């Protein structure tokens, strides 16, 4: 259901200094914090209105750890670039994502911690919260490092523990932005390519969260394939959009429909023209 | 085990020092500590791999670390307060992981007196050796400066740690430039004392690669009992 | 900066008792905790390292407890011994840096059977040493610019506490060894 999650990325920068490191934190589908190796602040700036009221001890607290991260990333890149027998001027990436999610009962359901180097997978925490998966042999030892540093444990106790403990703290405080459901704004446009053919266009704007399914029927059949679907994309207010369209022989328009189903709508919305 | 040399070192205002620490095989993390008594302990720099992610803990610029497995620590411009025990520890990989500690390296600022010790071995009582029946053996080393004197007990050339005793704190003769004094004992059975050689040998750390210049150099000096 | 405290520096137990120290540390943003032992001058040793709430690890006769939300970590010693006598350190690790609470140091009091307080001599190789043996053990030696002693140290089947004393001028050192003792010489 709901979840609070941190994505981490540090990009190596050769011959021009410290690897850039971007840390950004999400709860549900919105963005509430940020840290940047090239930030003016050199500290953790709030990105969502509801979290700014958090204590002066908080931002100091958080900042302190996110630094520790970029330290460790500045470490990771290095202590990977020698595992893989690679140059100094390669400018590689390391990615870490971690976080916990909760049910409608609002308690621990899932824990994720995952880690990939220079793109494809490297190591990921099994959902066991007691074991690991090694994509490479290089990983399999990092596994064996953590397997002995008892690393599974600390993270587990964090995720089952204070990750959740704070996730509710966030939600209850950001009741306004997080717990809402703003049903999508539905629109439809016709744009011709010829007299021979035409292009019907299905618009869904201003919706939160972003997970939306909008489909498109001919007489009841899902014209699966002549249709084009585009990655659900963001906007201001931190709201989302998606767009789907097809070719429609002229005049046979009113045959075509559009179904926009979403958590904000009790039952799917049938969009027509018109 | 861990290795960390020089065991001790004494030098003066405005010169360099190289502090070695060799972690155990396969260690990957290293910590540098200094302790000013009686300030308490606080932490200076941690190293991982070959990289120093944090600096802003060791106090000033003269301090700077290099990692060369083994690594060194350099402070140019040895000055007044940089006068503490410098400790080095290693945990595999990982910060929270169990640290294992080096021997230790003392270091004292100053410019200047410095001299090696007396070693005089006393011998026990007419009647005490028959009182217990008990036997006993004493040692005593004074007139030296500065502290970096560690005791070695020898007998037949092979060391003994069974009954020996060294005092923990040195004895300032007074009270702030005055020099030191120490006293180690021993007890041995009495039939044992009838024609062997019980060595109270004492290590003073001077300078045996000559520095500016009654010598006085790394020496062992020893008083013997029968 | 966030604070750490231990309590207190100074414990003196009778070698039969048990003992507990009190390392405070914050609630928030905990990750790890460390307990260290520091005899005199020699290797400080990692004893336990505490990871999670609420664990209870023990080695031999040394034991320890972690509590996270309530900021504390107790450490118990069982069946105190001479060997134990050291200084104990708790460390607090969060965000890739360490925070040591002001040390807490342990000294036990070696109990001995059959005490015979004979103050033996001095030495020759012709100079002087004046001292005491046995003498256990809250009979505490404490002195005076040229009258020299040391206090004290303990041995090996039996243990002996002995405090050497020496001087030079005039006063000699045995009736002068008076600074306590009775029923001794």
């Amino acid at each position: 259901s709901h979840s609070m999650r941190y994505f981490f990325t540090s990009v190596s920068r050769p011959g021009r200094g410290e690897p850039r490191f971007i840390a950004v934190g999400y709860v549900d589908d919105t963005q509430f914090v940020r840290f940047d190796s090239d930030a003016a602040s050199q500290r953790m700036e709030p990105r969502a209105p509801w979290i700014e009221q958090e204590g002066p001890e908080y931002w100091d607290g958080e900042t302190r750890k996110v630094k520790a991260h970029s330290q460790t990333h500045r470490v990771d890149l290095g202590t990977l670039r020698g595992y893989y027998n690679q140059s100094e001027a390669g400018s590689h990436t390391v990615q870490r994502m971690y976080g916990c999610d909760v049910g409608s009962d609002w308690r621990f359901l899932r824990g994720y911690h995952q880690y990939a180097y220079d793109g494809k997978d490297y190591i990921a925490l099994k959902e066991d919260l007691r074991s690991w998966t090694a994509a490479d042999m290089a990983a399999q030892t990092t596994k064996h490092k953590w397997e002995a540093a008892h690393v599974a444990e600390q993270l587990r106790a964090y995720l089952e523990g204070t990750c959740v403990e704070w996730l509710r703290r966030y939600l209850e405080n950001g009741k306004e932005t997080l717990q809402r459901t703003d049903a999508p704004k539905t629109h439809m446009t016709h744009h011709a390519v010829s007299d021979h053919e035409a292009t019907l266009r299905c618009w869904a704007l201003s919706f939160y969260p972003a997970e939306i399914t909008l489909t498109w029927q001919r007489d009841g059949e899902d014209q699966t394939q002549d249709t084009e679907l585009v990655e659900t994309r963001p906007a201001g207010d931190g709201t989302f959009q998606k767009w789907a369209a097809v070719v429609v022989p002229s005049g046979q328009e009113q045959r075509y429909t559009c179904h926009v189903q979403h958590e904000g709508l009790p039952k799917p919305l049938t969009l027509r023209w018109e | 085990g861990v290795s960390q040399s020089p065991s001790n070192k004494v030098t003066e205002k405005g010169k360099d020092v190289e502090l070695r620490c060799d972690p155990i095989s396969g260690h990957t993390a290293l910590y540098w500590y200094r302790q000013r008594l009686g300030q308490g302990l606080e932490f200076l720099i941690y190293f991982q791999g070959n990289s120093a992610p944090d600096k802003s803990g060791l106090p000033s610029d003269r301090f700077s670390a290099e990692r060369t497995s083994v690594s060194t620590l350099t402070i140019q411009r040895t000055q007044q307060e940089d006068s503490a025990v410098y400790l080095c520890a290693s945990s595999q990989t990982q910060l929270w992981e169990t640290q294992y500690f080096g021997p230790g390296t003392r270091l004292l600022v100053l410019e200047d007196n410095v001299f090696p010790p007396e070693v005089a071995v006393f011998e026990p009582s007419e009647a005490e050796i028959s009182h217990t029946q008990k036997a006993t053996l004493v040692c005593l080393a004074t007139g030296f400066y500065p502290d970096h004197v560690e005791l070695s007990w020898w007998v037949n050339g092979k060391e003994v740690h069974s009954g020996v005793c060294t005092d923990p704190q040195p004895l300032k003769e007074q009270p702030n430039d005055s020099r030191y004094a120490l006293s180690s004992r021993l007890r041995v059975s009495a039939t044992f004392w009838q024609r062997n050689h019980f060595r109270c040998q004492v290590q003073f750390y001077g300078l045996s690669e000559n520095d500016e210049w009654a010598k006085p150099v790394t020496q062992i000096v020893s008083a013997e009992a029968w | 900066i966030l604070n750490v405290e231990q309590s207190p520096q100074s414990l003196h137990v009778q070698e039969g008792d048990s003992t507990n120290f009190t390392c405070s540390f914050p609630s928030s943003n905990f990750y790890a905790l460390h307990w260290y032992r520091w005899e005199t001058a020699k290797s400080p040793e990692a004893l336990f390292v505490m990871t999670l709430n609420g664990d209870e690890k023990k080695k031999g006769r040394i034991s320890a407890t972690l509590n996270t939300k309530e900021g504390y970590s107790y450490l118990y010693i069982k069946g105190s011994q001479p060997e134990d006598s050291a200084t104990y350190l708790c460390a607090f690790i969060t965000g890739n840096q360490f925070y040591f609470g002001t040390g807490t140091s342990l000294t036990v009091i070696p109990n001995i059977q059959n005490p015979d307080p004979a103050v033996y001599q001095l030495r020759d190789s012709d100079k002087s040493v004046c001292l005491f043996t046995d003498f256990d053990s809250q009979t505490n030696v404490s002195q005076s610019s040229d009258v020299y002693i040391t206090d004290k140290c303990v041995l090996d089947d039996f243990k002996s506490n002995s405090a050497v004393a020496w001087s030079n001028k005039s006063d000699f050192a045995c009736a002068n060894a008076f600074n306590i003792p009775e029923d001794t010489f």
Binding site: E62, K65, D76, Y98, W146, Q154, Y158 | - | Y31, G95
Partner: peptide, 9 residues
């Protein structure tokens, strides 16, 4: 609240 501290490889 980020995890107080992570590991490395």
């Amino acid at each position: 609240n980020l995890v107080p501290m992570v590991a490395t490889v």
